[PDB]
Amino acid sequence: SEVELVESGGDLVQPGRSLKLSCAASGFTFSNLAMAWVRQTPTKGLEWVASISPAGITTYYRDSVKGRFTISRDNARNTQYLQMDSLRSEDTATYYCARHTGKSSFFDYWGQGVMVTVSSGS
Amino acid sequence: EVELVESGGDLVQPGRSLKLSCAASGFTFSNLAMAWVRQTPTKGLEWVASISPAGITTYYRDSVKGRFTISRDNARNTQYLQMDSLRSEDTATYYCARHTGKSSFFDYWGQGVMVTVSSG
Amino acid sequence: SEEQVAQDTEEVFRSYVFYRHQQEQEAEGVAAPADPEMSSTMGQVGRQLAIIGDDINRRYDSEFQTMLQHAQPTAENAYEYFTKIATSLFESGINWGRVVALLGFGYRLALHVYQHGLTGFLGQVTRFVVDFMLHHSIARWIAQRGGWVA
Amino acid sequence: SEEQVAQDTEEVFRSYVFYRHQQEQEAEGVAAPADPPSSTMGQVGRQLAIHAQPTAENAYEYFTKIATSLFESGINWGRVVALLGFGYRLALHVYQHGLTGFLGQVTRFVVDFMLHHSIARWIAQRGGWVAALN
Amino acid sequence: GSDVQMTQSPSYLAASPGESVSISCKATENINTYLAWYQAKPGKTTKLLLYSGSTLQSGTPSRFSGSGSGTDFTLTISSLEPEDFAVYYCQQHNEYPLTFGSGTKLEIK
Amino acid sequence: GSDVQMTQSPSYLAASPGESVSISCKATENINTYLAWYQAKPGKTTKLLLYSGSTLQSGTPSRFSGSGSGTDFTLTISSLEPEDFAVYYCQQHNEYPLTFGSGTKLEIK
């Protein structure tokens, strides 16, 4: 029916640790469209983090997260993931779930946003 | 009847100089961009440098920026590659290549010239 | 044969509308991450014809160069050869460009009627194509040139 | 008017062959190193160089009429642009195999054919050249 | 081998229903005509307004209009309606990595 | 920010006249469809086979065919001819610096 994307994997985490995000989807055939992750940094604006092919074979990453972040998906459960390893004080942002319109690189629908904060204290 | 022939190869010690030269025929030389590609014994195939048809604009790869200089004499139907301060990583077979049109793939190639850098 | 080309249309048209559909949902900008890509004679004919579309002149423009390369026009018999070709764009007749345009019309027929129609309209459109091609001498015109393999 | 389309072709065609040549040798990919017209009819040459919503219970009558219209004699906007493209292939391929540059003598050949075979009037009856971008 | 950077302008806009208003989005490098516009509201989900510089997305009102050459783009809201009060982001989809803009807030004056 | 690196596979291939065969060329970053293929013979000069992923170069036989999305490309020789035994290199022409592949040598089986 109606398209909806819901994220859940937000938390407060220490620097250098790991954290895996999860985005649930409904309202469309999940195994037919490419998904992506976008984050809203307190200073560095809006950043595209990663995108993944419909079947998950091909993945694109941005330079600042290449090697640390891993994007994945489980088409059986209509869910995509974002495994953030070796977190940094710059990875703290609001992470949004986004669906590519078709085979293009702009996004039909978005998620509501999940909060990830990387900090030791203060 | 296009043919490209390079000639400026030799065996040289590191840090010295060496100037390559590529002669062209079978087309209007002053209308197409030329390039140099080298085949490294280890580092595969590398695009080295390209030059505009009139020679005003030149592109270089990062590893050769500052040392290699590409030039051409459209009056003499010849392009050059001035290799200064050669290194043990610059030894390869250097090929002459002609851009197809305004694109970055190559119509015809040269026969190949051998440049070897070694401290003895 | 006129009967052979009639049935070869079934695979040529279906292979045409399939690849015509794969390019109408291509990217608009840089393409999203795509999975790696890892076919009869009439099935491949539909693929080669699947490009172009409304720019049928791209077939005419290419047919210009190849026609300018075949007869090799000069300046002695040019005005006779020039007005003859220019008139051939508007005269009644059948050329390879108009046949591909007919296929593209079937694509817009099968597609645009599926949206506003009660059913999926793939089988009923090949019926519309075979009936029209067989009648208006298109099947005979194609057959006398060797077949779809052209 | 037939008078408007007749001479406006000179600007539309001369701008058409210019932009048609500018894209035939473009940078299919990244460009190699390279060294270092705003009127209505001037832009029309560039725009060309680059409804009834059918139903079900009475479709077959409207379908076979249109399908036959692809082969019949007549004038549509596609054939007019195709005629322009022929002038491009004429001016280009004859410049290569000709002693001189044949742009002025070819625009005459194009206008004459349009004026004769009622094509120029057909364009005028649609409003003019400005009627193609719809 | 640098990244395209989108510069949105202005950052803060104050208008009233009925007025006209425009937002500029400039790119450091050429992006052809591939620029998308998004509409972000505090409560609701983000909406796709335009793509490819000028093509309206299914459901976008006709009062929205986008113009853009190669590195200079403009979004234009003609007759401003109360529903057209949100934060607007431009994103180029001409090359990877995809790049958004800082954002433009359209507040009520 | 980094250079695209083409990974050709397989490195060594042995086939016979008449058979069909394909060679894969992968890119580290997106190169859209701008991949060229070259044919290198021991005696003769290197020839341009394809460009822009699928466009045959003037003079290339119809048995050559290339397909490729964005980071995954394939060269395909349909009906293998005895003259078609050589070494093949893929090169991206989507951004500078231009990058070639390691190479694939096609010997006689």
CB contacts < 8 A, C to F, total 22
CA–CA dist B55, B48 (Å, integer): 16
Domain ranges of chain E: 6-108
CA–CA dist F103, F109 (Å, integer): 19
Burial class from Cβ neighbours inside 10 Å (0-12, 13-18, 19+) for residue B68 reads buried
Tabulate helix, strand, coil % of chain F (nearest 5): 5, 50, 50
State whether residue C118 sits within 8 Å of chain A by CB: no
State whether residue F3 sits within 8 Å of chain C by CB: no
What is the least distance, in Å, from the CA of A68 to any CA of chain F? 16
What is the least distance, in Å, from the CA of D95 to any CA of chain F? 21
Q: Burial code of C12-22, b = ≥16 C-beta within 10 A, e = fewer?
A: bbbbbbebbee
Partners of B39 in the beta sheet? B45, B93
CA–CA dist C29, C52 (Å, integer): 19
- Of B75, B37, B25, nearest to B55 by C-alpha is B75
Backbone angles phi, psi at B26, to 5 degrees: 95, 5
- For tokens 């007919």, name the residue: C102
CA–CA dist B111, F45 (Å, integer): 7
In angstroms, the Cα distances linking C36 to A28, B107, D17 are 23, 28, 40
CA–CA dist F101, F92 (Å, integer): 9
Q: Which domain holds residue D16?
A: 2-131
Residues 6+ positions from E56 with CB-CB distance below 8 Å: E49, E50, E62, E64
CA–CA dist A11, D101 (Å, integer): 72
B49, B59 Cβ separation under 8 angstroms? yes
CATH classification at residue C12:
1.10.437.10
DSSP string, E75-96: EEESS--GGG-SEEEEEE-SSS
Q: Test D28 with F95 for CB contact under 8 angstroms.
A: no
| Orientation of helix C96-115 relative to helix D59-68, angle to 10° | 160
- Residues of chain C found within 8 Å of residue D75, distances taken between Cβ atoms: 90
What resolution in Å is listed for this PDB structure? 3.1
Residues 6+ positions from B46 with CB-CB distance below 8 Å: B37, B38, B40, B61, B63, B92, F97, F100
CB contacts < 8 A, E to F, total 10
What is the least distance, in Å, from the CA of E15 to any CA of chain C? 33
| Orientation of helix C2-24 relative to helix C41-48, angle to 10° | 50
- Residues of chain D found within 8 Å of residue F96, distances taken between Cβ atoms: 30
CATH classification at residue B48:
2.60.40.10
Please indicate the experimental technique that yielded this structure: X-ray
State whether residue E57 sits within 8 Å of chain C by CB: no
Question: Going along A2-113, which residue ranges are E strands?
Answer: 4-7, 11-13, 19-26, 35-40, 46-52, 59-61, 69-74, 79-84, 93-100, 107-110
Q: Can you say whether the dihedral through the CA atoms of C105, C111, C116, C122 is positive or negative?
A: positive
* Portion 31-70 of C in contact with A at CB < 8 A: 31-36
- Residues of chain C found within 8 Å of residue F32, distances taken between Cβ atoms: 30-31
Q: How many residues are listed for chain E in this entry?
A: 109
What is the least distance, in Å, from the CA of F109 to any CA of chain D? 37
Backbone angles phi, psi at D57, to 5 degrees: -60, 5
CA–CA dist A43, D114 (Å, integer): 62
Q: Test C32 with A105 for CB contact under 8 angstroms.
A: yes
A52, A59 Cβ separation under 8 angstroms? yes
Q: Is D116 annotated as a binding residue?
A: yes
CA–CA dist E5, D130 (Å, integer): 37
Partners of C77 in the beta sheet? none
- Residues of chain B found within 8 Å of residue D31, distances taken between Cβ atoms: 102-104
C149, C45 Cβ separation under 8 angstroms? yes
State whether residue A51 sits within 8 Å of chain C by CB: yes
CA–CA dist C148, C12 (Å, integer): 8
Amino acid occupying residue B49: A
Which helix (H) or strand (E) element contains residue C133?
helix C123-135
| Count of domains observed in chain B | 1
Q: Tokens at residue A117, please?
A: 């904060």
- DSSP character at residue A2: -
Interface residues from chain C to F (CB-CB < 8 Å): 30-31, 33-38
Q: Which domain holds residue B11?
A: 3-117
Partners of B71 in the beta sheet? B80
What is the least distance, in Å, from the CA of F71 to any CA of chain A? 8
CB contacts < 8 A, B to D, total 44
- Closest in F48, F97, F103 to B106, CB measured: F48
Q: Test C68 with D85 for CB contact under 8 angstroms.
A: no
Q: Tokens at residue C114, please?
A: 């599926």
3-state secondary structure of F76: strand
- For tokens 């419909």, name the residue: A54
In angstroms, the Cα distances linking F8 to C35, F72, F102 are 17, 10, 6
Backbone angles phi, psi at D101, to 5 degrees: -85, 120
Is residue C128 situated within a structural domain? Answer: yes
DSSP string, chain D: -HHHHHHHHHHHHHHHHHHHHHHHTS-SSSPPP-----SHHHHHHHHHH------STTHHHHHHHHHHTTTSS---HHHHHHHHHHHHHHHHHHHHSSSS--SHHHHHHHHHHHHHTTHHHHHHTTTSGGGS--
Cβ atoms < 10 Å from Cβ of A106: 26
Q: Report residue D111 CA to chain centroid gap.
A: 12
F29, F74 Cβ separation under 8 angstroms? no
Q: What is the dihedral of CA F25, F31, F36, F37, to 10 degrees?
A: 0
Chains that touch B (3 or more CB pairs under 8 A): D, F
Q: Test D26 with B59 for CB contact under 8 angstroms.
A: no
Chains that touch C (3 or more CB pairs under 8 A): A, D, E, F
B5, B22 Cβ separation under 8 angstroms? yes
- Of C72, C81, C82, C66, nearest to D106 by C-alpha is C82
Cis bond before residue E10 (omega within 30° of 0): yes
DSSP string, E16-69: -TT--EEEEEEESS--TT-EEEEEE-SSS--EEEEETTTEEPTT--TTEEEEE-
Cβ atoms < 10 Å from Cβ of D61: 7
Q: How many residues are listed for chain A in this entry?
A: 122
Is residue C72 situated within a structural domain? Answer: yes
Burial class from Cβ neighbours inside 10 Å (0-12, 13-18, 19+) for residue C140 reads middle
3-state secondary structure of C10: helix
B116, B89 Cβ separation under 8 angstroms? no
D26, D34 Cβ separation under 8 angstroms? no
What is the least distance, in Å, from the CA of A20 to any CA of chain E? 22
Interface residues from chain E to A (CB-CB < 8 Å): 3, 36, 38, 45-46, 48, 51, 89, 91, 93, 96-103
CA–CA dist B9, B6 (Å, integer): 8
The DSSP bridge pattern shows strands F104-108 and F12-15 to be: parallel
Q: Report residue F62 CA to chain centroid gap.
A: 15
What is the least distance, in Å, from the CA of C22 to any CA of chain A? 11
- Closest in A34, A55, A57 to C32, CB measured: A34
- Of B2, B32, B14, nearest to B90 by C-alpha is B14
- Of A65, A114, A112, A73, nearest to A91 by C-alpha is A65
Q: What is the 3-state secondary structure (H, E, C) of C90-131?
A: CCCCCCHHHHHHHHHHHHHHHHHHHHCCCCCCCHHHHHHHHH
Chains that touch F (3 or more CB pairs under 8 A): A, B, C, D, E
Architecture of domain F6-108: Sandwich (2.60)
| Count of domains observed in chain D | 1
- Closest in D53, D56, D85 to C60, CB measured: D85
Residues 6+ positions from D10 with CB-CB distance below 8 Å: D107, D111
DSSP string, F8-37: EE-SEEEE-TT--EEEEEEESS--TT-EEE
Residues 6+ positions from E68 with CB-CB distance below 8 Å: E25, E33, E35, E53, E54, E74
Which helix (H) or strand (E) element contains residue B2?
none
Q: Tokens at residue C90, please?
A: 């508007």
Q: Do chains C and A touch (3 or more CB pairs under 8 A)?
A: yes
Q: Tokens at residue A21, please?
A: 């995000």
